[PDB]
Design an enzyme around this catalytic site. Structure first.
Site, short mmCIF file in Angstrom:
data_model
loop_
_atom_site.label_atom_id
_atom_site.label_comp_id
_atom_site.label_asym_id
_atom_site.label_seq_id
_atom_site.Cartn_x
_atom_site.Cartn_y
_atom_site.Cartn_z
N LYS C 3 0.83 -1.18 0.00
CA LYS C 3 0.00 0.00 0.00
C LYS C 3 0.87 1.24 0.00
O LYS C 3 1.95 1.25 0.58
CB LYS C 3 -0.96 0.03 1.18
CG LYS C 3 -2.10 -0.96 1.03
CD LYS C 3 -3.24 -0.64 1.96
CE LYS C 3 -4.28 -1.73 1.90
NZ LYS C 3 -4.91 -1.82 0.56
N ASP C 24 -3.52 -2.73 10.69
CA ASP C 24 -4.98 -2.88 10.65
C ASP C 24 -5.46 -3.79 11.76
O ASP C 24 -6.14 -4.79 11.53
CB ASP C 24 -5.45 -3.31 9.25
CG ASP C 24 -5.28 -2.18 8.20
OD1 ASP C 24 -5.26 -0.95 8.59
OD2 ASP C 24 -5.12 -2.50 6.98
N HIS C 120 6.35 3.58 28.93
CA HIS C 120 5.68 3.30 27.67
C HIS C 120 6.43 2.24 26.85
O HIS C 120 5.81 1.48 26.12
CB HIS C 120 5.43 4.59 26.85
CG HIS C 120 6.67 5.33 26.46
ND1 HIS C 120 7.37 5.08 25.30
CD2 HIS C 120 7.33 6.35 27.07
CE1 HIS C 120 8.41 5.88 25.23
NE2 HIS C 120 8.41 6.66 26.29
N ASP C 199 6.51 17.32 14.48
CA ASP C 199 6.13 18.29 15.50
C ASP C 199 6.30 19.72 14.97
O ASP C 199 5.39 20.54 15.13
CB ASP C 199 6.89 18.08 16.80
CG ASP C 199 6.50 16.79 17.52
OD1 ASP C 199 5.52 16.09 17.16
OD2 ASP C 199 7.22 16.47 18.49
N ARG C 213 20.24 13.90 4.88
CA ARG C 213 21.68 14.14 4.83
C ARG C 213 22.43 13.12 5.67
O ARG C 213 23.36 12.47 5.21
CB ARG C 213 22.00 15.54 5.34
CG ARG C 213 23.47 15.83 5.32
CD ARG C 213 23.81 17.23 5.76
NE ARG C 213 25.25 17.34 5.81
CZ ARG C 213 26.03 17.63 4.76
NH1 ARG C 213 25.52 17.90 3.56
NH2 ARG C 213 27.34 17.65 4.91
N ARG C 331 -10.99 27.78 30.65
CA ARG C 331 -9.67 28.36 30.74
C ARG C 331 -9.45 29.03 32.11
O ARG C 331 -8.78 30.05 32.21
CB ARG C 331 -9.45 29.35 29.59
CG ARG C 331 -8.01 29.45 29.16
CD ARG C 331 -7.59 28.26 28.29
NE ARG C 331 -6.20 28.40 27.82
CZ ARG C 331 -5.59 27.52 27.03
NH1 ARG C 331 -6.25 26.44 26.60
NH2 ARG C 331 -4.32 27.71 26.66
N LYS C 403 36.85 10.74 5.32
CA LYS C 403 36.84 10.51 3.88
C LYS C 403 38.07 9.74 3.39
O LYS C 403 37.95 8.88 2.52
CB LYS C 403 36.67 11.86 3.17
CG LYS C 403 36.90 11.84 1.70
CD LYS C 403 36.30 13.05 1.00
CE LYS C 403 37.28 14.20 0.88
NZ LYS C 403 36.95 15.08 -0.27
N1 LIG Z 1 26.50 20.98 7.10
C1 LIG Z 1 26.22 21.03 5.77
C2 LIG Z 1 27.25 21.05 4.87
C3 LIG Z 1 27.02 21.13 3.51
N2 LIG Z 1 25.75 21.21 3.06
C4 LIG Z 1 25.47 21.15 1.65
C5 LIG Z 1 26.34 21.94 0.71
C6 LIG Z 1 26.53 21.02 -0.48
O1 LIG Z 1 25.52 21.24 -1.46
C7 LIG Z 1 26.38 19.60 0.03
C8 LIG Z 1 27.68 18.82 0.21
O2 LIG Z 1 28.64 19.54 0.99
P1 LIG Z 1 29.62 18.80 2.03
O3 LIG Z 1 30.30 19.87 2.77
O4 LIG Z 1 28.86 17.73 2.73
O5 LIG Z 1 30.64 18.11 1.03
P2 LIG Z 1 32.13 18.55 0.62
O6 LIG Z 1 32.48 18.03 -0.78
O7 LIG Z 1 32.31 19.98 0.90
O8 LIG Z 1 33.01 17.70 1.70
P3 LIG Z 1 33.77 16.24 1.47
O9 LIG Z 1 34.27 16.26 0.04
O10 LIG Z 1 34.81 16.36 2.56
O11 LIG Z 1 32.80 15.15 1.77
O12 LIG Z 1 25.72 19.75 1.29
C9 LIG Z 1 24.69 21.19 4.01
O13 LIG Z 1 23.50 21.22 3.62
N3 LIG Z 1 24.94 21.14 5.35
MG LIG Z 2 -6.59 0.44 -1.77
MG LIG Z 3 34.04 17.18 -1.67
#
Ligand SMILES: Nc1ccn([C@H]2C[C@H](O)[C@@H](COP(=O)(O)OP(=O)(O)OP(=O)(O)O)O2)c(=O)n1
Ligand SMILES: [Mg+2]
Ligand SMILES: [Mg+2]
Ligand SMILES: Nc1ccn([C@H]2C[C@H](O)[C@@H](COP(=O)(O)OP(=O)(O)OP(=O)(O)O)O2)c(=O)n1
Ligand SMILES: Nc1ccn([C@H]2C[C@H](O)[C@@H](COP(=O)(O)OP(=O)(O)OP(=O)(O)O)O2)c(=O)n1
Ligand SMILES: Nc1ccn([C@H]2C[C@H](O)[C@@H](COP(=O)(O)OP(=O)(O)OP(=O)(O)O)O2)c(=O)n1
Ligand SMILES: [Mg+2]
Ligand SMILES: [Mg+2]
Lengths: 481, 480, 479, 484
Positions: C3, C24, C120, C199, C213, C331, C403
């Protein structure tokens, strides 16, 4: 001339008084359509295509909202239509002084190109505003709507740049209207409508679901007497939201405005501008020619200095511009200077602006004690020092906010940090140090990492987050790590 | 080379395969950062600062989403990773051919500058794509990820421009459905629209009512007349009519805003007056003009919205006239809108006749006292075709559906099986008239000519006709 | 078949037919009649959402994360069986909530059954067992490849923790699966991610934390001979922000001073109704509101409906309970007097909560008062605020990867991130309210309250100088 | 005492005048917290948990926004604070008359339980409002803020329900013709363009997970009052005409997607059935301790005050053997053993099915003689036939023909705009009927049979071919050449 309505994605349909429309429909204001709000940030966040123009409209609109709200709730303040228009105009015009790629221009380029000069976008805004008014015959139009140019122009400039010793340093309005100076650019604590617009607008474009609830704040704002001034006071309940507002600001700097790659792209663009500065000509008053670095001395030239400089360099064929053009082409191919890492000074240590230039030399002077194929020189390193704070250096801006309580709405009070929460920051300023290498090959980068981590160890900076991975032979020598 | 993640405000965090990253990090693609999606629309809607670059990323992403969804639900289609990458590349690259201020360039400027030539942004995209590939050594990189450049480059181009009996060479009939993702020539239902609906709405400050995620969840491939095509669940037919309604709304409110259009027209005018003097260097150092840069991709690479500012900031006396028009835009001294009408007659005003229309308006003989007499050159007449993407045809008649009880059996649904509240026609023309003389007396006169012309031609009564031309509207009993 | 459901937070979500079968049932559909935020709806009129829709979102997000890990790391051998078990635990972790959610186990049960230890979470495991058995779900589980003996145990362990490697439902190489639904190690789990977004959408607050992310950057790495979920190093700032957001949402909404007093008034009404309301459980046996937790068949029928059953009652025995609820409708609520916090070391213990109204009433403010207040006129609410792990920093219990070495897990300390972060991770707020709402009582309550703060060396209330100008000067520490 | 601020997710922080706060903090208003806006829709769209309470606050707020905007732009209208408060109150209180599960109660239950009576939630709202005022001593508080209860209470009721008398001429008593525009804000009887729609578009979309296309803030900026046939009326700027046609399109979309969702409707039908079977046994205490039934609680406002969605749970959790049949239907909802949707069709050409004939339709479906082999034979009682009227709010009429516009060059001169002056891509018809058929027998063989009967019945009646007709009834559809 009648009111225009504009559809903004952040604020919806907003009404503009005809005097504001007249100021907007000038070359000096329309210029802001060609300056990215976030500069090199667009090269990292593809939604951040927005320019200073639409931000300015929003600031002007929010400034009007707040001053109208105060006047409606408190008629005894005697806020006039003249006051409203002067506040809106200051709001509209506080971004006029920005240069190409916004903070790149005055944060990086001008300090390097004209080290002797003391230039800020705020000063630029005042100069541009004056030039806008005079060049377009706005003073008569102002008079037509009941403004008094002598006082009001002064008032507008003071709202942007502060006082042009004393209890009351301002000339545009008296102490009973003190609260009007807190709307557009709040020098006391940084809580102003400029932030409120950019929080909402930058978030909308960046793809971050954050903002400060400014509509809430406007509903709870009052004017009270504080030390013989009439000031804006926030309801006591709102103190937590204000600490959150500064947290949001710091988050946005960390995530977006000081993104390590956004910064290195700004740095590369600045480098291209420095190499182009002898050859690009900008015509100013009386046909005189200026350079990128001297256009700030003539507003007629500065009017024509926008992000367009980037493309003029990129699309040039002149061999003189070859070096500048090559740097920009590296940006297009994404062959950027390489990030090496980040560290911080420990505890209370601070680096100063005068020392920034000596830092690449120090990194290159570190002696790692690792086998290295290549030896790096000072010129191969970029060291970027970034100040992160709550807008007032080491000070807590909430110590400079006045509050009122529901049981005594006319009585202003102070609220200290300990009356709010123990989970708040214990410090309000810090520095980040980013190191990058201009040599991008595998062996240079490996070496750069060893120098960098060795330098951190020698200086007693914090251990880089990936220190053990990037420099496993260096990090053991430091037991503290 | 590894996958990159990018944060888009519409789609969130998007993953890009390293081959796509390689295509994006070229001058030919990065160029799209300097071309506004909505052209002159930014001068009316201040939130519309978005460029073609970020739209292209979104199209590439959505194309990947749809082809993956189909493959996952129907493994028997034999969609390969190669197919996915080819569809994503076509999606990324279908906007490569756009020129300065997007639809201004090929909708207004090129037709006036090079009337003999037949140019579309689509053709431009294929040429730009070829140039991008060859200039940057992308073919080897394609091979490295399992693509076959000969057939796949052809497939990519066909997805953008159509065929260069089963007319396609890049894929066979059993993969017919792959040609429906990026630019759907059969009915216009494709991922390009889905991205721009959501992106344009986000920036314009208007809310989008088409749900592409929903559509993806209900999409299937079924056999239709010996082709495998994408079919929508029967239930979704209403939502598809709504998708075209939304498109038409967005055109009415934003893309054909009367002031956005006249700004595009004024910019076009400035470009025409600058065309003899601006030089763009192309291959081997040859110089091109704004109007001829389309003949050399190396030159076209450098042709963006920057032309506007190069003109505006010029000091050359030769560019004085072009520069003056742009300065009129900055002071908001725009050509004045006079009004709008529509033909009642079913013959469309033809493109060949567009040029004769200002003459006709100026030839009208309104029986009213006029201070000033206007000439053909004082009038601009803009003819706008509004439709559901297929001229007079209902695009939903060219959609195939399936039912829950028989998911592999394609069916047709006619308009009468859906609702009586739907359009009875699917195409129409709007005619806007503007005056280049902006003073009060010229404008008054322009209104009288315009309404008289409407009456003579038996066009519809302009909405404010009785207010702007009270002496003219009574003569037409059809209006009263 | 699958579904599709349209959720305003997540869009169109696909549900596997086994999940649909679990949904359900009376035991799951019950969650449609329990407000997520309890008394918060009486303050934030957008917060009409129930536990039902939150549960769907948790189940969906749990599926998203486990699918993402399996696709990026096939070597983990995540099976379709694992995915379904994680989704089911996600769907079912809210099953144990009672009327007005945290009101029931945070206020009512502690007062009604002080001897018992009820959460809970425990309720969810019991409800889940009852759901499975009552509806013949085991066979259906088998039909989709699940092994009920192991998998039911795995599901329960995901919700409540262990019933050496202490888990029986899955071995150490699948350790990372226990971190998805209810993360005992550091609290970073899909339950928070759904409620932040849901929320915020309903409250009218902008919801931070980008879980999409986070999912894109999550990996499994070996940590001390367990396979654990690790975050990319660069995400450490976002995680501190996630806990900041949580704490904000508690400050603004979940611990709103009026929301809390409404919960308190409802709890009071339930206590006065507890002897008279009858809930039929297994075999026709009757239970009370406070004992329905001992029989799942009775508990199934214990929802927000109890509120309206009391409110609309005509029985004279329910008159006192009904009167309290009627005060909510008009109230006429108990009045907030103020807030303070303990200073220096001090922490107030649960055992002392009952003595606090007595202490406030015993304060001797040196001011002229028309009225004298008694202990029973005061309510004192003690709220523990933290980052989910008492005094501990939960980011010290997160593993990261870089990385340059994706398979090597590392630790990141607070000092490596920022000096602008909290120095402490737990604190207490003390709210005082007065049941006497007239002007003179309120004035008096304020004098007592501030005097009590002074005597105890608590922090100066924010409006202290305004509400009690004669009292605050006596304390030099306050100025 | 003073203004309260409330945080609404649609409108943000809204200010409420203390008089409004007093009206809100009553049992009669707080009742709306226990009535789902979309009734059985929540059982299909899990985000649609919102209740009538928060919608009412939004309507009250938007009514205030529009009347303030008109007064600010046109001081010559002499809009008083008294007018503003009266309009806000009517906005707040126009949903007071809703019953359990909103449109289920007055659209399905009351027509079946009390066929003779003519009940609408609007009438209910007026009666509830009177009861709210009198029971809570609001009249004195009204006087304290400058209202005149006699004339203003009448004005408020007229805004909700229209003229309270036969005038057969200006039919309203609460305000004169020069304030006629005030009657167009809350419940617009002339063309249906009012602030009630504007709130529910934005709120329902937010909760349903659908995006709203109508911009009310825009409309408010462009609204003016002009003289039209000796009344002062609200006029829209000419170029907003396209946005108004879009507003009705959006309304029709929302009905198609959500409010008339085939399953949402059958859940409403099942709940109605349970209520009909419970109606003899549930007791609701009204004035003076008198007991009422679900179907008679509408005759006593004190009883009606306590009639909310709670009835559903009272039935579901009952142990009384008398409620066994009602309880079993609700239990089928919990297990999702719903009556099965068979299909949808429409009448062709002019055919219009009358309310009086609705009850004969299950008989007709069962009387169809599909020429197909069937293992089971179905009876009238096994079929449910739901007839749905879809329109632009005014039967066959185009509501934009009843809107007045003004042009930028003459802001005080009202004009008309016809459909042909706008677009040829608009609807040619403004009303239609959908017919949905369901089967109460849910097994595979019954459902197969139901499909054959249904399609045969469509063919016999010359209704439109169901969309899946060839798939569900391949042996039946060939006999109709009009379908082939
Ligand atoms: N805290 C963060 C950092 C970055 N961004 C955004 C900006 C980019 O559009 C995308 C990727 O950026 P990153 O900084 O995660 O990736 P980099 O290439 O800069 O770092 P690395 O190559 O070290 O993974 O996410 C985000 O929304 N919030
Ligand atoms: Mg249906
Ligand atoms: Mg990069
Ligand atoms: N259906 C529409 C039309 C326009 N706009 C936006 C674009 C502008 O930011 C703002 C004003 O545009 P208008 O078309 O209302 O105003 P004009 O100035 O073009 O019309 P006029 O001068 O006739 O009032 O509203 C919109 O959101 N929706
Ligand atoms: N036009 C529509 C119809 C439904 N929904 C929503 C409501 C549900 O939460 C979800 C699934 O509804 P469907 O109508 O698609 O599902 P049904 O079960 O009614 O259809 P069927 O059983 O015929 O597939 O999508 C929607 O957003 N837009
Ligand atoms: N930080 C907060 C606090 C409250 N609210 C919401 C909840 C309510 O819908 C509305 C009003 O709450 P307040 O706490 O401002 O109002 P009170 O009446 O509780 O405070 P007081 O009476 O002390 O002013 O705003 C909010 O959005 N953010
Ligand atoms: Mg205009
Ligand atoms: Mg309050």
């Amino acid at each position: 001339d009648t009111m225009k309505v504009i559809n903004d994605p952040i604020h919806g349909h907003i009404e503009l008084h005809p005097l504001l429309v007249r100021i907007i429909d000038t070359p000096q204001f329309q210029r802001l359509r060609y300056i990215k709000q976030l500069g090199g940030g667009y090269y990292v966040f593809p939604g951040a295509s927005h320019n200073r123009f639409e931000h300015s409209l929003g600031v002007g609109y929010l400034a009007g909202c707040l001053v109208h709200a105060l006047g409606e709730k408190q008629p005894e303040l005697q806020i006039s239509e003249r006051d409203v228009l002067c506040v809106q105009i200051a709001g509209l015009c506080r971004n006029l002084g920005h240069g190409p790629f916004s903070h790149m221009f005055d944060g990086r380029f001008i300090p390097l190109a004209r080290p002797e000069v003391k230039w800020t976008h705020e000063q630029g805004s005042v100069m541009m505003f004056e030039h806008l008014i005079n060049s377009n015959g706005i003073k008569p139009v102002m008079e037509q709507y009941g403004l008094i140019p002598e006082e009001d122009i002064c008032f507008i400039k003071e709202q942007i740049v502060g006082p042009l010793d004393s209890l009351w340093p301002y000339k545009g309005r008296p102490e009973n209207k003190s609260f009007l100076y807190e709307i557009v650019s709040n020098k006391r604590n940084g809580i102003d409508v400029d932030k409120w617009d950019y929080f909402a607008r930058d978030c909308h474009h960046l793809g971050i679901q954050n903002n400060f609830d400014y509509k809430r704040f406007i509903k709870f704002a009052r004017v009270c007497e504080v030390d013989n001034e009439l000031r804006i006071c926030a309801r006591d309940k709102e103190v937590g939201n204000l600490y959150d507002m500064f947290h949001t600001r710091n988050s946005l700097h960390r995530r977006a405005y000081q993104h390590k790659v956004g910064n290195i792209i700004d740095t590369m663009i600045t480098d291209a501008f420095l190499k182009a500065d002898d050859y690009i000509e900008i015509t100013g008053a009386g046909g005189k020619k200026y350079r990128i670095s001297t256009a700030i001395d003539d507003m007629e030239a500065y009017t024509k200095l926008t992000d367009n400089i980037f493309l003029e360099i990129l699309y040039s064929t002149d061999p003189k511009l070859k070096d500048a053009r090559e740097i920009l082409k590296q940006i297009e191919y994404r062959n950027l200077f390489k990030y090496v890492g980040e560290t911080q000074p420990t505890g209370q240590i601070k680096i100063k602006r005068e020392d920034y230039e000596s830092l690449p030399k120090e990194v290159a002077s570190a002696k790692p004690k690792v086998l290295l194929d290549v030896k790096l020189k000072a010129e191969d390193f970029i060291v970027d020092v970034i100040n992160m704070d709550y807008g007032m250096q080491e000070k807590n801006p909430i110590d400079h906010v006045s509050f009122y309580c529901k049981t005594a709405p006319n009585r202003a009070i102070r609220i200290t940090k300990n009356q709010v929460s123990q989970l708040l920051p214990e410090k309000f300023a810090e520095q980040l140090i980013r190191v990058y290498c201009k040599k991008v090959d595998r062996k240079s980068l490996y070496a750069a990492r060893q120098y960098f981590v060795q330098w951190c160890a020698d200086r007693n900076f914090t251990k880089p987050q990936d220190g053990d991975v990037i420099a496993p032979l260096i990090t053991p020598q430091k037991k503290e790590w």
